[PDB]
Symmetry: none
Subunit: 139 residues, 2 copies
């Protein structure tokens, strides 16, 4: 459910895209660097740390989720390497979105999910990234 995702609105937020993302995945970070080059998009990031690969990733995800402005914390970390200093964890949906992503068969990050119900495993660079998101708004 969208209320279980970090929501970043960029410009008018018109294009929609969701990402199952791991805060310690460099491919996820690179995707966030690309998103920085676009506007007029809402990005919904569902936390999907892959603990087998990234031992600290579930902790980072909960901490980022539980910050006062979780979109600010998410992008600060993914694009800037700024991690909260005294970040606490409260009841959060990370465990649940991690299970869901696995249930959906997403075996790797980032996995993008488009409004038309299609997905893409792995990031794309700009300008392509924008085109693909645009093309999958419908159908």
């Amino acid at each position: 459910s969208l209320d279980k995702a970090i929501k970043e609105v960029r410009g008018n937020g018109k294009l929609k895209v969701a990402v199952f993302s791991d805060p310690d995945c460099p491919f996820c970070k690179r995707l966030e660097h690309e998103f920085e080059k676009m506007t007029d998009v809402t990005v919904y990031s569902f936390m999907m740390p892959i603990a087998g690969l990234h031992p600290d990733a579930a902790r980072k995800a909960q901490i980022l989720w539980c910050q006062p402005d979780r979109a600010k914390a998410w992008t600060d970390w993914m694009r800037k390497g700024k991690f909260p200093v005294g970040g606490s964890i409260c009841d959060n949906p990370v465990a649940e979105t991690t299970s869901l992503g696995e249930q959906f068969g997403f075996n790797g990050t980032p996995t993008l999910v488009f409004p038309n119900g299609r997905t893409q495993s792995g990031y794309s660079p700009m300008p392509q990234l924008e085109e693909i998101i645009r093309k999958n708004q419908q159908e």
Copy 2:
């Protein structure tokens, strides 16, 4: 895009992390591996990205190396020493997949290095630069 689809070499304490989209017949990738041999305390994740149009035998080599019982030993032995498992078998494997992924990512040219901060580098670097660059991109 998943470490499970990469050849994993741990050198020393394996602290630094770096990944490489690499072609087994690319001398630039081979040189990168010569330089990796000189460094320590680093984990190297090598994703197979043979460029078939340039190196017609590379896809076979990548699949053979992936499919060896110790794929990191086969990879390093070939890239650093020229030792190849001539009788190695090819079974189902992720090379075609990691090849597509590299293309998708817009990588042209091997090696392409990816750092834990999400930044990339086209082409190798010599030691000690290579180590400096890896260390500097452990975080953004």
